[PDB]
Amino acid sequence: TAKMAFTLADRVTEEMLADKAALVVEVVEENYHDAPIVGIAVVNEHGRFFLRPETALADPQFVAWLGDETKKKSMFDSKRAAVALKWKGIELCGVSFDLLLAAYLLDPAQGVDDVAAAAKMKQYEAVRPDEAVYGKGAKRAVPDEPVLAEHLVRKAAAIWALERPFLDELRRNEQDRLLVELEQPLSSILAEMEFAGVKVDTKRLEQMGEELAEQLRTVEQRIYELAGQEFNINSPKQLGVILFEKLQLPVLKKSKTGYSTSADVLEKLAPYHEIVENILHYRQLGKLQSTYIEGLLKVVRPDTKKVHTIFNQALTQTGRLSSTEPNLQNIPIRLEEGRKIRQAFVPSESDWLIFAADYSQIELRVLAHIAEDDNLMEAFRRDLDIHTKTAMDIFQVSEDEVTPNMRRQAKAVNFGIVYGISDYGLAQNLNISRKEAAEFIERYFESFPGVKRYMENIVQEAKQKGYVTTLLHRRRYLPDITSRNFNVRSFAERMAMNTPIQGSAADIIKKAMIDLNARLKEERLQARLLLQVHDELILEAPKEEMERLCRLVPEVMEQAVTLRVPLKVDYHYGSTWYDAK
DNA sequence: GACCTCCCT
DNA sequence: AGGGAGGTC
């Protein structure tokens, strides 16, 4: 039942500082920013050691071992440790293997988020799930030293044992370089971006809040004035009663528990009553208020007026990053009212500016490359407007004859083609029939027979191999590709179509980040990566570096990989993120 | 805490 | 196609 052998050290010794080791720097708080490090474990050829962080991190030897690149560490989720240590003024170097990132690449669907889950992949179970040790939610606590220490040593021991088999399988999948040269170096770069953070103009945000608060009072009362009664507009029950009982509005869609009040459904009810337009407007504002003024203000650090996101680099099934606390990959841009929120994200130093660079149509360009569709590749070699070109082709008209509605619909098809494309899926999106939506898809394929071929071929490959891959050898297993349930098989077919596109795009932007970081250092620029939003990079830099960045950044991003079509990068800069358009 | 719309790329 | 993050039992 019990205890693995280890030295509960009272001070740091030399044999703890070997040049190969499994290391655990445990930060139990979910948000690791400026968070406590609760204990340390080291396992190496000389044994297993638990150290107290107050001891270890006050020790010159240990700190210098941490920062020594030639001293190789094996860890789980090294970025967590790295950041927590940065907030304490200590550099972590020499991380040559990260089990979290290794597990993520081997199979992203396992949802590996702790050492235990990773260990299980190789029939190793001599370690506990963090959830069992720390608890979950309100009962979540750091346990007493003997339980804590044994757990960190078991995790370190698991890392030590598991490196070789993980690396072995990564190599067999041709994923070794993907780990060592892309994801691991990216992890350090993300660490720097998170630590640096983004400066927020809180005063600006707060006055926006106030404008909104007063706009919401007005609409809220107008809504009660129109419903002839007061009610909870946010309630699914109360509103559905006002809409579909008291006002007799027609029921166009019924959800699981009742009537749908989604924006798509409401937009269609607006002609019937003046209440509907005010409810939409109320929700748009309420969204900005709750999610983007209030939400953001509670995560700004009052000391520096910065937000420090955490990028989850081991979550998405596609190889994309996610962003949390705050999520800075969903800041409004589409609607001008919401876009103004970006005026609150400002450079962290005076006389600095925000620089934003974004790939133009990277997904469709990746598709052109992997499908080798002659027409699509030509379209991009001509740097055509792709939605216009797709319109001309599916409706068989000249540039002159393409109407704005034709272009809107071709665009929707382009998106749908990217996401796997179903007559029913597009039909819903375009507010039209499943037949006829099928006519569009069919028509598209007549113009892009290479894309059609790719779609068919990749689904067959998914079935044959059990998975699909990206440009840089990221893998996604698709076991549902064989189910006899149409809906479940279909979704897996869509993932088979989409994942090489979206995943290859993720691959390219990650390499660009790595390449950009190396060029920034080589050039001695003070410019720093602040954020990544799937197909764009956001930096801040002195005004005096703008001109050099205008050349340097797009170029690095464009040259990250060489495809059969060119990659294209647009860029802008300004006093705020908003103005960097 | 666990089941059930709207913002982004 | 991927994500993150108020009412209600």
Side-chain angles (χ1 to χ4, degrees), chain A residues 39-135 137-138 140-163 165-170 172-202 205-210 212-236 238-253 255 257-276 278-283 285-310:
Chain A
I40 296 193
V42 177
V43 165
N44 62 29
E45 55 262 33
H46 300 317
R48 318 199 187 91
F49 309 92
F50 169 87
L51 286 153
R52 302 181 177 94
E54 54 264 28
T55 298
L57 303 179
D59 186 296
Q61 333 295 289
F62 189 83
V63 174
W65 178 81
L66 289 181
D68 189 345
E69 171 61 22
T70 58
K71 302 293 180 277
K72 301 306 180 176
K73 295 90 172 175
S74 294
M75 312 189 61
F76 185 96
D77 188 4
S78 61
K79 171 160 64 68
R80 163 172 292 269
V83 166
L85 286 165
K86 275 182 197 273
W87 277 95
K88 294 173 183 291
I90 298 177
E91 296 297 303
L92 175 59
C93 296
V95 188
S96 62
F97 177 81
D98 187 325
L99 180 61
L100 172 61
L101 293 180
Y104 177 63
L105 294 175
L106 280 180
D107 188 3
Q110 297 301 293
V112 165
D113 56 347
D114 71 358
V115 171
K120 264 214 176 224
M121 289 167 66
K122 302 292 175 188
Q123 316 313 304
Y124 188 106
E125 303 197 8
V127 62
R128 297 167 82 201
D130 285 329
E131 201 177 307
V133 175
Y134 301 118
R140 185 168 142 97
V142 183
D144 296 301
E145 191 167 83
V147 180
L148 179 49
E150 139 122 305
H151 179 49
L152 309 194
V153 169
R154 281 184 175 281
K155 288 210 289 189
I159 295 158
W160 194 241
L162 293 167
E163 176 178 335
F166 275 75
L167 279 178
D168 279 350
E169 188 182 357
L170 287 158
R172 278 194 295 283
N173 293 351
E174 298 184 47
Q175 287 179 311
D176 51 304
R177 304 181 71 201
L178 183 55
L179 178 71
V180 57
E181 302 180 22
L182 190 128
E183 297 290 2
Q184 288 180 171
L186 179 60
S187 177
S188 309
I189 294 176
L190 293 176
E192 291 168 6
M193 293 161 64
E194 294 173 0
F195 180 63
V198 184
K199 176 80 74 169
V200 175
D201 187 339
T202 53
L205 274 191
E206 285 167 8
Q207 86 182 212
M208 289 181 170
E210 280 185 14
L212 282 181
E214 183 158 24
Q215 289 185 216
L216 277 173
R217 281 192 206 89
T218 310
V219 303
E220 172 188 6
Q221 290 301 323
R222 178 80 205 125
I223 284 179
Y224 303 147
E225 205 189 329
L226 281 174
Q229 96 184 37
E230 312 200 355
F231 65 102
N232 183 10
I233 299 156
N234 304 311
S235 176
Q238 307 190 12
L239 176 73
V241 169
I242 299 298
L243 263 35
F244 311 112
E245 301 195 1
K246 181 156 150 49
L247 295 175
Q248 291 295 280
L249 295 193
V251 187
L252 300 175
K253 180 153 348 134
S255 58
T257 325
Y259 334 100
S260 175
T261 62
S262 65
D264 77 88
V265 180
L266 288 177
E267 263 139 18
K268 288 178 194 175
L269 299 178
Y272 292 106
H273 214 282
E274 191 179 321
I275 206 180
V276 184
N278 283 262
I279 292 168
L280 281 154
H281 193 44
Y282 177 82
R283 284 191 179 171
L285 304 190
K287 183 69 164 174
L288 294 182
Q289 184 70 297
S290 302
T291 299
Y292 297 116
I293 289 95
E294 280 168 15
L296 205 50
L297 287 169
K298 65 186 72 169
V299 288
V300 65
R301 309 256 156 186
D303 48 342
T304 61
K305 297 181 173 311
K306 282 175 176 192
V307 291
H308 302 263
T309 198
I310 293 178

Side-chain angles (χ1 to χ4, degrees), chain A residues 181-183 185-194 311 313 319 321 329 359 505-520 529-539 553 556-558 560:
Chain A
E181 302 180 22
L182 190 128
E183 297 290 2
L186 179 60
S187 177
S188 309
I189 294 176
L190 293 176
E192 291 168 6
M193 293 161 64
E194 294 173 0
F311 289 108
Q313 183 186 0
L321 298 180
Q329 298 175 324
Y359 287 101
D507 291 355
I508 291 164
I509 188 158
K510 294 175 163 184
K511 185 156 174 295
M513 290 174 68
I514 293 164
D515 289 349
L516 183 55
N517 190 63
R519 292 288 314 272
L520 289 175
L529 277 170
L530 291 185
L531 307 174
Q532 185 256 227
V533 190
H534 311 316
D535 70 346
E536 70 181 339
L537 299 183
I538 312 297
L539 306 79
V553 178
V556 170
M557 293 179 58
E558 287 169 352

Side-chain angles (χ1 to χ4, degrees), chain A residues 471-484:
Chain A
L471 228 53
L472 272 37
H473 303 335
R474 193 177 306 274
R475 185 173 282 222
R476 190 184 186 173
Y477 288 101
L478 293 172
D480 298 354
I481 208 71
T482 50
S483 100
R484 271 74 71 207

